[PDB]
Write a protein that binds this ligand. Structure first.
Ligand SMILES: N[C@@H](Cc1c[nH]c[nH+]1)C(=O)O
Ligand SMILES: [Zn+2]
Length: 257
């Protein structure tokens, strides 16, 4: 299919997805001495309705928390954007060890995991499928997760993993507002890039928060306890699902601050 095996992992991906070696790939290392402070960036505005929370699904290489995306009850606006963007999902990336689970790095520093909160351009497109492949189709807030004290805001999410332990398993996941997962400062870097796994479409305007959020070593352990096999097959823990940083290929990372 594609995955994070060594058989079918990131260094493998370009065979089926040549875009893997494109000019707008993600994640990046953000070099703070190379970032241009853009004064024209507005602040990030998020407004989510907890009722749009829908389902949690074990997707084999990760798990996704999906939201009702039929209307604009939950939206991202401001920042680099003229258009309002519509929440459809959030998910995490993590690695084998606490030393490097993040996707994005800052000045070489590798964090323990990363929260992606994903939105599509409902002003221009009529759906996620249509938006997903357009340069201006998706917005994703990335939040660096730094290992330390346990994070209480994760609780609902972690509690729900026992229901969707094996690949394909899903369950309702309702009444939750994921703006409660975001750090209390909204200062951010932006850049054009891509989905961080196949199909790797260069459709994403990234909003990387400057402030990290906490996670505990044992919270991370829950993520890696999820299984990539289907019920009944031998267990194959989801050890990691983060992709190496990619060449900027000429792009400029802008700072909101
Ligand atoms: N979780 C997917 C979201 C997606 C949008 N379109 C297709 N998939 C991603 O890696 O970026
Ligand atoms: Zn992601």
């Amino acid at each position: 299919d594609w995955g994070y095996d060594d058989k079918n992992g990131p260094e493998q991906w370009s065979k089926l997805y040549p875009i893997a070696n494109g000019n707008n790939q993600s994640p990046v290392d953000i070099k703070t001495s190379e970032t241009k402070h853009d004064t024209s960036l507005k602040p990030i505005s998020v407004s989510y309705n907890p009722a749009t929370a829908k389902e949690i699904i074990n997707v084999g290489h990760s798990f996704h928390v999906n939201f009702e995306d039929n209307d604009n009850r939950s939206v991202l606006k401001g920042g680099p954007f003229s258009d309002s963007y519509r929440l459809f999902q959030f998910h995490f990336h993590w690695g084998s060890t606490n030393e490097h689970g993040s996707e994005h790095t800052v000045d070489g520093v590798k964090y323990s995991a990363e929260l992606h909160v994903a939105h599509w351009n409902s002003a221009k497109y009529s759906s996620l499928a249509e938006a997903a492949s357009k340069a201006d189709g998706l917005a994703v807030i990335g939040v660096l997760m730094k290992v330390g004290e346990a994070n209480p805001k994760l609780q609902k999410v972690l509690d729900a993993l026992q229901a969707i332990k094996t690949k394909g398993k899903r369950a309702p996941f309702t009444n939750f507002d994921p703006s409660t997962l975001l750090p209390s400062s909204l200062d951010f870097w932006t850049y054009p890039g891509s989905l961080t796994h196949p199909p790797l479409y260069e459709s994403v305007t990234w909003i990387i928060c400057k402030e990290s959020i906490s996670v505990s070593s044992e919270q991370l352990a829950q993520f890696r306890s999820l299984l990539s096999n289907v019920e009944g097959d031998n267990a194959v823990p989801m050890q990691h699902n983060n992709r190496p940083t990619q060449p900027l290929k000429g792009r400029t990372v802008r700072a909101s601050f």
